[PDB]
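Researcher: Let's walk through a ligand-bound prediction step by step. First, I give you the protein sequence. Second, the SMILES string for magnesium ion. Third, you return the three-dimensional complex as structure tokens. Ready?
Model: Ready.
Researcher: Here are steps one and two:
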Amino acid sequence: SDPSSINGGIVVAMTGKDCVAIACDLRLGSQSLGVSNKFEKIFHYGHVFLGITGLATDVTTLNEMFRYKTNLYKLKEERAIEPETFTQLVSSSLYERRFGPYFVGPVVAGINSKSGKPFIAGFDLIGCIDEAKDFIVSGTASDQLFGMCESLYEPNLEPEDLFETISQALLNAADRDALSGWGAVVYIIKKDEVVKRYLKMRQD
Amino acid sequence: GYDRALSIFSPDGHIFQVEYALEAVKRGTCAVGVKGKNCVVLGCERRSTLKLQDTRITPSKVSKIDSHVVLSFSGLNADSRILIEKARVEAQSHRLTLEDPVTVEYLTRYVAGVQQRYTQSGGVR
Amino acid sequence: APLX
Amino acid sequence: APLX
Amino acid sequence: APLX
Amino acid sequence: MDIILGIRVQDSVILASSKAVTRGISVLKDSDDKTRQLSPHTLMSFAGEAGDTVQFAEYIQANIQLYSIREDYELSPQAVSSFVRQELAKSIRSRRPYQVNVLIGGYDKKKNKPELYQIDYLGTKVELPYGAHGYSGFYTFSLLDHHYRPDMTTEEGLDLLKLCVQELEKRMPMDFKGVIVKIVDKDGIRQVDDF
Amino acid sequence: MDIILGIRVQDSVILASSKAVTRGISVLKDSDDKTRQLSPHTLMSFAGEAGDTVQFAEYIQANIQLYSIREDYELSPQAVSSFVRQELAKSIRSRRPYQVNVLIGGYDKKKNKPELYQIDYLGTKVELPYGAHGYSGFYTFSLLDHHYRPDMTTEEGLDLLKLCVQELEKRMPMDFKGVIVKIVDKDGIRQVDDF
Amino acid sequence: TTIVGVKFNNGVVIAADTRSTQGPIVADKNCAKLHRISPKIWCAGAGTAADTEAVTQLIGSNIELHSLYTSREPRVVSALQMLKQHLFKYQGHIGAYLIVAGVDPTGSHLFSIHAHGSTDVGYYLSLGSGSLAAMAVLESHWKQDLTKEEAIKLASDAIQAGIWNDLGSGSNVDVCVMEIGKDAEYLRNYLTPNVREEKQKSYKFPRGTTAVLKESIVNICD
Amino acid sequence: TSIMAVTFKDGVILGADSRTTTGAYIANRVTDKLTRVHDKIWCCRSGSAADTQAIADIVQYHLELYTSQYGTPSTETAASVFKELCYENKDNLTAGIIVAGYDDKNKGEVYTIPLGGSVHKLPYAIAGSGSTFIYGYCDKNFRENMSKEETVDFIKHSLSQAIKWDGSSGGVIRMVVLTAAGVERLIFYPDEYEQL
Amino acid sequence: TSIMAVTFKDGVILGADSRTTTGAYIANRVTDKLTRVHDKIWCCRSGSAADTQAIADIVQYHLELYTSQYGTPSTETAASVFKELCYENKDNLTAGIIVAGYDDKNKGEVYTIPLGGSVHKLPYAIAGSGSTFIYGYCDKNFRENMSKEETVDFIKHSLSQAIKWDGSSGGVIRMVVLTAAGVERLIFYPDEYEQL
Amino acid sequence: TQQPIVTGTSVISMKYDNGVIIAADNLGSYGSLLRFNGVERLIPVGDNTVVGISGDISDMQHIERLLKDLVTENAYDNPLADAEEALEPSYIFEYLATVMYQRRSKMNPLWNAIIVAGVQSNGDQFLRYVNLLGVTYSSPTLATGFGAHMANPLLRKVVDRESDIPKTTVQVAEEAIVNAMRVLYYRDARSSRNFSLAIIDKNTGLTFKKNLQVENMKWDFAKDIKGYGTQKI
Amino acid sequence: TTTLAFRFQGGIIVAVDSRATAGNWVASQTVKKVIEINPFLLGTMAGGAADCQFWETWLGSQCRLHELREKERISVAAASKILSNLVYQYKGAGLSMGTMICGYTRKEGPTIYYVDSDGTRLKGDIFCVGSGQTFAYGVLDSNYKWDLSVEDALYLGKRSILAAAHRDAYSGGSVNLYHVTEDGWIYHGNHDVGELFWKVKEEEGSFNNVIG
Amino acid sequence: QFNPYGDNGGTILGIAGEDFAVLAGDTRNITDYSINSRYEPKVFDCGDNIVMSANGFAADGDALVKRFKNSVKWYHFDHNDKKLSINSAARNIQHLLYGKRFFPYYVHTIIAGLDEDGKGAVYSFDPVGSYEREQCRAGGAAASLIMPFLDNQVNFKNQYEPGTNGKVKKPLKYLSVEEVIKLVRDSFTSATERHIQVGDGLEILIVTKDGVRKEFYELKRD
Ligand SMILES: [Cl-]
Ligand SMILES: [Cl-]
Ligand SMILES: [Mg+2]
Ligand SMILES: [Mg+2]
Ligand SMILES: [Mg+2]
Ligand SMILES: [Mg+2]
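Model: Step three, the predicted complex:
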């Protein structure tokens, strides 16, 4: 009965040269029982990408909430929300539920359309913003992801190379976690093109 | 506890207490065992200086250790009861742990081992 | 119990 | 917590 | 002490 | 309550639900129908805490029927499942949450496709080819992983379902008194009387 | 373990014991014989804590068999039941007590009478015309109070027993996978293979 | 966390380390623990990270509105009063432990605030898990009438004591100097004594190492 | 804490140690526990630092508003406002407060308010964890109508012993003198009071 | 309990109240807490009545057997036997004991043995629940090499205050004087010591 | 299973070029009551070892008796008891470490944290720690209780690694120890002003200093501190 | 864990996974969960790793002492009962074991005994033990026949472990197969689930839930 | 209530080559958030070309190593100075650990050396005596960080031959002692960055047929 580890799952984000990458596993379970291998944890509002780990009901709820809020934002602002702004919105919304929080570990990723700067950020379940030049990790195999990323990561990787690094970070981390795996997805994000790749991994 | 070594070696290499125990066997009533092609027969002598006996209740010379094994003896009658009792207990203990009755060789090996132990234990004959 |  |  |  | 199963095949969704209602050391009923029709082409089965199950099911039923009358239109299975999920998601942070797990089987008339949704009491929604709640999954899922194919007929789905019930009747500790089976397809909802 | 029943009729004692062995959410076995022959005309059925049941039953079996060999004589059912009671009475104040409940069915050859004894894990002995342990009694006792007669035949006893099993199969929450039935009479112990 | 505050001649200086931890794991190796409440009032925060950020922003927002309303530059005692009354109301459930420092028309000030709402005044203060290591240094080397350059040295030395000796603290030293009559100078990564050494090997994979099942172009446009 | 207030011929004097504790760690060794609620009405704070600060601030606010409407409040009035807060919120407060003030009519007065929120008017009062060790000493040595110098010595010697035996008390001995002449602050350092 | 022992010029004096408590009920108002373990080695008992009685009886037995073989035991020896019992059985005992004796070589000696079973040789010792209230008073008033009359007054005044403030202490003040001259018992009643 | 009653606080120590220094205050606390003031918590063993003990004082006095008995036992049938076969610091430590671990393993610990400081026969500095759990470790600086949090940081500024030991004199080392004791008096609520200090040097031997006091304290700045925030007067 | 063993026309199949877990941490993927008690006897390991490993090796020493003393191979019944009587002595102390003693002898023929730490001892034809037992049972029960070929039976045991490895989070790594015959036990290789899953998916057409 | 266990942190790592084996471990010893020692070794040469480390609760760790070293000594006395093989040592250690099954040694034990064919061998144990031979094992506080990295770099997991459609794996090969030490050093520097209980120093014991060699490297001290 620990809300953050009932369903399982992981998300990782990385920066490269004029690009960003965000990746997640596909597992959704009920403790030991694997239930779904199609449960994607990454969503996007315009060009801003959000990954969410933790309690699956809250993952779904928050996606619906941030779709709601970014749609109203766009109608009133007459422009798409940027990653820096969206990061603040996520932080505010989570802290609003300070003493009854959503049991999640969100991760923002994207490129600012005006400046062209790659951006990533992470949060705890109550809104604390964790900004990083290199990488953000989240989920039931976060320890494993921290270990993989810290060793494998180098700065200014090209999109094609960055794909290999983030993929290997996620895969090998997921295989040391019982509650993560069962498939994986990787998003490679450039200034005005986004590629989505499903990875082949062991299915146990 | 009484500790005295009663069974000991003598200069000529004999253990007199074991040899004197054989003399008690020589005094006992005769017992014979013959095995055929599909059976074994145990015969036993009963001395006839005892008339007015009650053969219904008098201890029989041949004793069942289990339903498939028997034991007869020659020598001290009181001593034999102790061996028979231990043998019967081991027979049931074997069935309980191995889930199979004892072999005749195993049962013999147990009884003999008890007899041997009493030849080099302190305070016993 | 009795104390002192 | 701080006590006095 | 892991389980199996 | 206890056993609810669901299988989505080529042209239909099949729900199977146990008939037993047990309270203490007594089976009070052996013919209980653990399902409600939400709309002509949408069926919901349920299991969980006593009282909460039926109260929740009928509340959802009333709301979907209200929507149907207001708009003179049938909500899609996807739309119904999202509504149901949100109600459970609200419930989990209430003073006293609905402890109810559901399967929603529906046939989308606009897409001409069967759809099976699995939603637990936390508001955890997933679309699946086959689904279960409770301890049922621990036997059926592995069985369906092996024997299930996406292009199966309704008759093939029913045989696949018989195989699951047989396994549950063999290895489950409790007597659940068989199952009521219902099919959802283009022509609506009907019950299999001989199972 | 779970269901053990006993019925004493005119000329015999009938014991019925459930075949299921359940551990967790899995029925590990559906053909388990929950009984041991203590002597040619004495049978003991048992139920309770896993491990303790068989360990206790076999320990008693060994002791009665030892007695039989020593005296070349069969102990009466009354004598065996008293020995068993004392062992359980010792056990209840031990460091770790045997959590085992038993029925002892025997035919006394000296009296030419069947005898049924009910002993629980505390060492509570009673001689009864019919007996049960656990939740089984809550259904069967009232049924037997009505239909039981002291002059019944073995065949009438078996039909009376069928009526009890049918009631348990209807109202009990758990699937106990039927029963093994054994009869104890003047000619010894035999098993009914088709029940 | 290790945070300190030190008063000097014509103002005050605060400093902090830059490690944030979830359990034994270092989540962020270079977070910013120095917060701005107003231009010349700065805050160092320890404890629950979300609480310190949220409470500093809320009071910082209300201080700005108050400054506009009164046509006056905000005072440190106002930020102190608003923070303590907010924290007291929540009975310690908002886990914000703060060192507040700044300059205003009244002069230069240095305070600490605990989660339950108690405040303290001092010429030198330390909070966080490395406060004992820091306070040991402060108690050894502090004196009356410190210069600007002496106070910065003392403050950063106190943070270093925490960095090296406290497992909860690490990485870099941030500093902010608030002097009377001058603009406050925020010195981000004033010291960086924990640079990662060159790795022994490059783990850049040959392209094609990762097995792939499906590819697809994602539509981000309207 | 170790705190006390003592009435004398010319008025009243408040006394306190300067230690703040978080566990066995001294969070503040130069704390000021003698706090102004009005010009010549002060209080000694013991118990929770947060609770006693919050109370003192509210009382100061009440007495400032009192003064704006009805002029200078009596020491009894100040004690009443403290009581009202301590009594009505007894379940959520850990505050042992001594209220002391100087009127011209009533001269020096001391009111002690323990945990429950009861009020007790006394010639002198002692409170805090360290007070336990000086009940004997203070009872034997206190006299009514003492001089300023005698009262200062009485408080100095008393808190010196309280500090010596109580691990939760220490630092400097602060004092506040309340008379017709005005408000005087005194401080005494370890090197003086330890070797008394 | 309130108990103490004080060394002086001619030897040592033990002092105690006479109150035994079962809750708030006074089970015995005339208790004797000053206890002989040898001719001129006595002890003050505090804590559990049962535990301290059982210990004292065992010590008396040990010292009687010691005397039969090796002659008169030292006060240090008696304290050691107490310690051994209190230390080794610390988990099951609630006994705060002060040991006091008179040798001709060593004169008056006082050893205090708190709950843990540690031993502390001191010029004077105070113990029991009521001692807390007189740490200040006793520290300020104790002098070494006092006369018999001065030491009696010191103990009388000290226990008087302890009794005044401690609800768990009261009744009469018993004392036992240990000198070369012999063993003298003293008693002091409420009407005398209350109005000191 | 125990609970400590009468307790002693921090013991602090460090290595220098020719030997080791160790110190501890003279207080025996009884909860919050500062009960006993004449308690010696440094105990010399021979002329080459000093054992500093914190925690339960009744258990400390037991350990005193064990060390006392160890000296007696070592002298038995030993013509070289005051020479080659004298008790080394390493022997004394291993004995205590054995006892501490055995007692924790019987769920009846000696409720203490112990630091054994000394000089070996070959001139090597010895400094090692052991506690109620039987945990042992060595370092250029070692401290118990609050000393671990406040003293170690200060002592590590002088001797941060092994190579700093030859560069540290007895004058500099003692100055750091005395400074650390002052900081502990400022900040530890169960500390006293009075303390003992011992130096074990490979040339000048064992120097035991009693009745030392913390001095040169800074308190004057307290007069300027008024109120807890907004208070002017 | 997931372990199984079943009896059939050609003897006994024994199949196990190879995963060890400390909570949600995957400790190992290469654990030997079949203990080679002796060339004729196999023990399976589920529950406490140490408990199983220690006491089943110990069991092997007791079986060796039996054949030295009795000049004859121990029976499967007697071997299983040594273990069950041992754990029963420890009952309540906190041992955790779910084992299966499998072997072939002349007098008994192919025999399987289930033995666990609360003292249960059961003779039976089919058993699945472990946190993924239910997943293994499903495939095994719905596909078992006494007349299975040695080839087919080997696959079913392998396929059953794979089913559990896939669904149970605490089962995985690789499959270890054994065949037990009169002549003794024969090892049938270590099969990594990494490659085995995709191989089975493609060739069998099963596992449609998974993104291919 | 008295708690007989504690956590002394630190992390260890064992890798086996073709004709060699390494057992590495950091030299930091901790309790809670404090550092006890920056250099307290916990990897030991036990004789007979066996190196050992028992990480977790240090008191239990030292006791176990002490008992095993003593076991090696008596093995010589009782069996005519016969060399204790690594497999025999492993089985012996199981009985040492399981002997305290109901009051366990709170340690993860790893030993390394050469098998009887001269090939590199690493054995790893759970607290109660379950053991297994492996090419690769990380233990202790940062095991979760290091282990998945080794799976990827030593055993080449999730790595496929470029251009082969993820059909053919990258094939396993033995690593040289130079390559292994690179992986050890990078593993520990990464663990030092992200785990607070890991740092100060790294000590590596290398075992070949010639004997046991040592290497030491500095780690970050924050
Ligand atoms: Cl304050
Ligand atoms: Cl008494
Ligand atoms: Mg996985
Ligand atoms: Mg799995
Ligand atoms: Mg003090
Ligand atoms: Mg580190």
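Researcher: And what stands out?
Model: The pocket of magnesium ion (ligand 5) is lined by residues I 163, 166-167, 169-170 (CB under 6 Å). Chains C and H do not touch (no CB pair under 8 Å).
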